[PDB]
Specification:
155 residues, alpha+beta, Aminopeptidase, seven-stranded mixed sheet, 7 strands, 30% helix, globular, binds potassium ion, transferase, Acyl_CoA_acyltransferase, N-acetyltransferase domain-containing protein, protein-N-terminal-alanine acetyltransferase activity
Length: 155
């Protein structure tokens, strides 16, 4: 039974551990800009009016997804991460579709996101989910993070 809900920890550090496992899952050897802890992020997101979701297989946390309000009608998808062993079942898509229905019910008509240009598999999923390419920027930080900005209108 795959279940999607608002994230609720089984134990206080469950999210930290899940997130560290996702960051550790880097087989192509991409450079990583590490991120408060994810639990702090979630707390702040909820205080700002956002929401943070789990997907579980039985009791096992297998995915997460955040929604962060930009304004009255646009939300930003954030911290979207699936355990890569569940990528061929289309469970990333299942979690996103639940999150999207939630967004829609909440009065959002646009979801925006940004993603590293190196992350092919992620970009390909977002395309599959109906995100459209708006712009690329090499974000200077000197480290350059080539970044893809995408949106989806909801109906
Ligand atoms: K890289
Ligand atoms: K819903």
């Amino acid at each position: 039974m795959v279940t999607i809900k608002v994230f609720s920890p089984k134990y206080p550090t469950e999210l930290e551990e899940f997130y560290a496992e996702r960051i550790a899952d880097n087989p192509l050897g991409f450079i990583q800009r590490l991120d408060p802890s994810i639990s702090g992020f979630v707390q702040k997101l909820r205080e700002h009016g956002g929401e943070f979701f789990e997907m579980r297989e039985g009791n096992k946390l297998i995915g997460i997804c955040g929604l962060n309000p930009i304004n009255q009608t646009e939300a930003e998808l954030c911290k979207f991460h699936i355990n890569s062993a569940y990528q061929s079942q289309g469970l990333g898509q299942k979690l996103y579709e639940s999150v999207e229905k939630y967004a829609f019910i909440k009065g959002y008509t646009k979801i925006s996101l940004h993603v590293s240009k190196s992350q092919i598999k992620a970009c390909n999923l977002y395309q599959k989910l109906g995100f459209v390419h708006i712009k690329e920027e090499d974000c200077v930080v000197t480290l350059i993070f080539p970044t893809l900005f995408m949106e989806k209108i909801l109906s």
